[PDB]
C-alpha cells in the first residue's frame, strides 16, 4: 500500500556504532575434527543406510502387486537389455558375449549400492562408442597381421581373427577398471560439483556429435565395409570419406535387410509414441524384429548363398575372472576420466528425470559410489563401462516398475541368455543389431531442434551448444568434451569480465534508481554522477571498470590532472616574470559485487586517490558487509579514506551530497 | 540529515505502466559499417598520429634543455645497454656477438612506432631465458657432435665449436619473427584484453620462479661446468643436481672472480639505493666492474695459465640480413605465445610505473604494434625477443630522461660497440657477465616477501602466487605460465560458483536489511524468510542455489511435497473404508546477479513451481532491469508467474506481505 520510512542518513559509521555485531565462531580445529567424527551409533546407522540403500526399500515392500509388476518389467527389460548389449558389443569392438556379460554383472552390483528405483543399468551407445574409439586408438588392426597362409607373392598377412579379441577384451577391462577407480575416487572424496560444469547445451552438443559418430559407425557396420580404423583428428570425416569411396564393396542383402528393419522399427516406434492413448505398454518392436530376423536368416543360408555377415561366434557360457592388466592407466587416464564423467552425468540426468516423475529423491555421491563399484566389479569379469540407456530405462517405467527388483529380474533373462539361450541367435545378421542402435538415435538427433530456441534465448548458451557439437567432431569425441568444459568456463569468465554497466538516475519524488538507457523521464542530481557496475571487480575487469568510469564521467582522471599541471607551471612563472566542470561527485552503485580480488581493491584505492586530486568525491552506495570486511583487510581504509565515504543505500549518498551542498556552498 | 520518502509500493507493474521506456537504437548493419569507416580527413590524421607517435613529441621538443639531459643519459645507458645486451645473450644460448644486435636494431624500430618516452627497449633476463629454453630443446648439444679428430678408441666425437651456433642463431631468428607476428596480431585485431589475465600474483609468482631458473642457469657459467641440457619436466631440478655432482670439475679462477664481483656489485647497488639523498645519479657499478675485469684479465693470461673461461669470439662486425627459416612456426607456436605475452606484460608494467610518475598516458594497443614491428625487424638481423629491463630503464630516468632521444643516443654507443669497440672485451671472463645478471635478480628475489602479506589479504590471490611459482618450476617455465593463467581463471569460476549467501533480516523501525550472521538485534518478519544470493546463477552454481534455499528455510520443497502425497493417499482411502510450518513466504534478494544462463533460469521457474504446490510464495527483491528483460526472453513469465511476483526493493516485498495478510487472513 504505502511505502513510507523515516530514519537518519546512516552512511557507514552512523549505522555501525549503535549496531552491535555478532562474535564470529571460534575455529578450534581440534574440536572441529572431534565433533565431525561422531561416536554415537546414530551416525553409524545413518552412514550404513546411506552407503547401502538396499535396506530401505526392501522392508517396506508391497509384494501383492509389486511382484507381478516387477516380474513383467523384469522379463521385458531383460529382453531389451540383452538385445541392446549384443548390439552395443559391436560399438566397443568386443565380441558379442562380452556385451551380455556387461549387461549382467553391473545389474547385480547395482542392487546393494544403488539409491534409485527406476534405473536399468547396462550398456550405452555413447559410452560403448567411446570405449571402442579408445580401444581402436590404443590397439589398432594393423598391429596384429601375422604372416601365414602361403599367399600369392608376399607373405600371407591375412586377418588375425582370434587372439586379437582377447587383447581388445583385456584393454576394455583395464579401461573399465580405471573408470571405476576414478568414479570411486570422485565419490569417496565427496567431490560432486565437478559434474556441474556439464551444462545443458554442452551435453546436448556432445550427445549430438556422439549420435552422429554412432550413426557413422553403424552405417559402416551395415554396409559391411572394412575401413582403416581412422582415429585422432577428423576421424569421423575420414571414415565417412572412406565409406563413400568404398561403396562398391558393399553387401546388397545386408543393406536391404538393414534399411527394411530401420524403416519398420522407426515406423513402429513413431506409431507407438504418437498413438499412446490406445496402447499404454510400449510394444517391444526390438524383440519381435530380432526374432523374425533370426528366423528368416536361419531358413535360407544367407552366410553361404548371399555371403551375409552373421555373428556365429557365441560361446554360450561363462568364464573365470581374469585379473586386469594394470599398467595402461597413464596413457588412458584422460579417456577414462571423460568416460566416467559422461556416464555419471547421463546417469544423474536419467535418475533426476525418473525421480521427479515419480516424486522421490536420489543422492548423487551414492550413485557415484554405486557406479564406481559396478565398473570395478565389471572390470574383473571382462566387461565395459556400464550406464543407463534412456530407451531401456523407459521400459520398466512404462510397463510398471516400483523398486530394483524388476532390475534384478532383468538379469535373470540375461543369465539364461548367457548359458543356454543364444544358440538361435547364431545366424543373426550384424546389420540387424546395428539398426536398432540407429533407431534409438532419434532421441539425440532431434536435439538439434533447440538451437533456434536457444538463439532467441540466452545467446551465449547457444554458442556453447554449437561449439561443443563441432569441436567434438573435429578432434575426436573424448577430447571434444574437454574443449567444451573449458569453453563453457571461458564463456562464464567473459560474462563476468564484460559486465552490463548503466547510467543510473533518480526517479522524481521517489527513492528508486533505474538505468538511464532504459527509461526516459529520469532526473539525475545536479553535478552528481551515479554509476552501477555488476560482475564484481577482479584482476580481469579492472581496465573495463576504468573505461566504464571514464565513459560515465565524460573525461579521464589522468589527462585532466596532466592538463592542470601543464597549466599550473604557467602560473608559477608569471609571478617570476612580472574538463571536470559538470562532475561534482561520483556515486558508485557497487551493489552487485561479491568478491573484491585485492588486485582490484588497489585499483579502487588508486581511483579514489586520482579523483580526490581533481576534487571529485567517489562515494559508494550498496557495498555489502562481507565485501567491506574484505576491503578492510586488504588495506583500503587509511587515515584519509574513512568509512564515511561509504553509504548504505543509493539515495543516502545523494541526500548527503545535497545536504553538504546546501550547508556548504 | 533526514531520509524520508513517501511512495506507493510499486512492485514491478505498478512502476512499469506510467514509466515510458526508451526505444532501443536501431541496428542497421548497413549503416553501422558505413558510419564506422569515416571518410573525413580527421579520421586519416587520427590513425596516423596514433600508429606513429613520433610525430607528436618531436615537433614540440625542448632542444635547449632536453638535448642536454638526453646526451648524458644516452651515453650512460649505452654503456649499461651494451653490457646487459651481451650478458643476456648467454641465457639465449646464442654467441655474445648477437647480444649487441638485439640492443641496437630494436631501438631503431621502437623510435617511430613507440608511444612511450622513458622505456629502453632491449634484452631481458626472463625473456631471454624463455628464448634459450626452447633452443636447447629444439637444438640440443648431442645433435651436432661430428666424429673427427682421431680419438683414442672410438670415433673422436668432440665438441662442435664453430657452425654449431648457426643452428641456434637461425632458430632464434625464427622464434623472434613468430613472437613479433603474434604481437602484431594482438595489435592488428585490436585484442588487448588477453593480457589482463596476468594478475599481479600471477606475474609476481612467475617472475619470482623465473629468477630461480636464471640463478641456476647463470650459476653454471660461474662454476664453468657442462651439464646435459636437461629440458622438459623438472628441468631446473635435474640441472641443479648435476651441478652438485660436478662440483669437482669447477674452476677456481672463475669462481673466485665470479663471487668477488657478486659481492661488489650487490654492495654498491644496495649502498647507492639506500643513501640516495647524497648522490642522485646512480653510479654505473655494472660498467666500472666490467672495465676493471677486462684489465686484470688482459694483464695475466687467465686463459692459458689459469684456464679461465673467456669469450675470445667477437668478430667486431656486422652481417647482411638473413631471411628467417620459415617452417618452424608449427612446433614453436605454443612456445611463442608464452614469450609474446610476457614481453608485452613487462613492457606495460614497467611503462605504466614511469608513466604515472611523469604524468603521461601510454597507449595500450600501440605497444603491441611497436614491439611487434621491433621483433619482426629484429628477426631479419639475427636477434631475439626485445623487452624493457627495469634496471636499464631506471638509468635513463634517474639520470634525466624526457623522450626517446636518450634511447637513440644509447644505440649510438651500441653502434660503435659493434664496428670499432669490442676488441678490448676479448679477454672478458664469462663469469663476470653471468654475475651482473645475478645481481639484478635481487628485485625479483625480494618478491617472496609479499606472500605473508597476501595471506592476510585475499587468500585466493595468495594461492595463485604460490601455485604459479611452483608450477613454473616443475613443468618448464613457459608451460608454467599457461598453468597459471588457467588456474587464475579457474579461481574466478570457483568464487562465482560458491558465493557468500546470508540470512538477511530487517532492522527495526527502518528499511535497511543486513545479514543475520553479522548483526544480533535484527528482527525478521513473522513467517517471511529472506535470502540473498550473490554470484549470479549459472549452470555451475544452480545446484548450490537449491541447497542454499533448503538451508535458509529449514526443509526441502521436494521431500515435504512427497510426504504430503504420502499423507494424502491415507485421506482418499478413509472415505472408502468408512514441515512447512514457519515458512510463509520466501523473498529472494537477488540484487547481486548480473547474467542468467538460461540453463540456470529454468530452475528459477522450477523453484517457484516447487514452492507454489506447498503454498509458499517465492518473491524477488532487487532484480535488475537488464536481468528482468532476460527472463522474459528465456520463457519465464507464463500465465501463472506474472510480474507482480517481482519487486523493486527488499522492503516492498515485505510491506506487500504485511498488507496482504492483514487484508486477507
Ligand atoms: Cl538409448
Ligand atoms: Cl633487470
From Swiss-Prot, chains A, B:
GO CC annotations on file: apical plasma membrane; brush border membrane; extracellular exosome; membrane
Keyword Hydrolase found: no
Extracellular side: 92, 140-174, 223-246, 300-327, 389-404, 453-469
Family annotation (InterPro entries): S04_transporter_CS, SLC26A/SulP_dom, SLC26A/SulP_fam, STAS_dom, STAS_dom_sf
GO terms classed as biological process: animal organ morphogenesis; regulation of pH; regulation of protein localization
Main location: membrane
Keywords: Cell membrane, Chloride, Membrane, Transmembrane, Transmembrane helix, Transport
Alphabetical list of Gene3D superfamilies matching this protein: STAS domain
Membrane topology: Multi-pass membrane protein
SUPFAM superfamilies reported in the protein's UniProt record: SpoIIaa-like (SSF52091)
GO molecular-function term, one example from the UniProt record: monoatomic anion transmembrane transporter activity
Zinc-finger recorded as keyword: no
Subcellular location: Apical cell membrane; Cell membrane
Summary of the tissues where the protein is detected: Highly expressed in the kidney (at protein level). Throughout the endolymphatic duct and sac, in distinct areas of the utricle and saccule, and in the external sulcus region within the cochlea. Expressed in the parotid gland.
Catalytic activity: chloride(in) = chloride(out); iodide(out) = iodide(in); hydrogencarbonate(in) + chloride(out) = hydrogencarbonate(out) + chloride(in); iodide(in) + hydrogencarbonate(out) = iodide(out) + hydrogencarbonate(in)
Residues annotated as domain STAS: 518-657
Transmembrane segments: 71-91, 93-113, 119-139, 175-195, 202-222, 247-267, 279-299, 328-348, 368-388, 405-425, 432-452, 470-490
Record topology, Cytoplasmic segments: 1-70, 114-118, 196-201, 268-278, 349-367, 426-431, 491-665
Origin superkingdom: Eukaryota
Role, per record: Sodium-independent transporter of chloride and iodide. Mediates electroneutral iodide-chloride, iodide-bicarbonate and chloride-bicarbonate exchange with 1:1 stoichiometry. Mediates elctroneutral chloride-formate exchange.
Subunit-level organization: Interacts with IQGAP1. This interaction enhances the chloride-bicarbonate exchange activity of SLC26A4.
Name used for this protein in its record: Pendrin
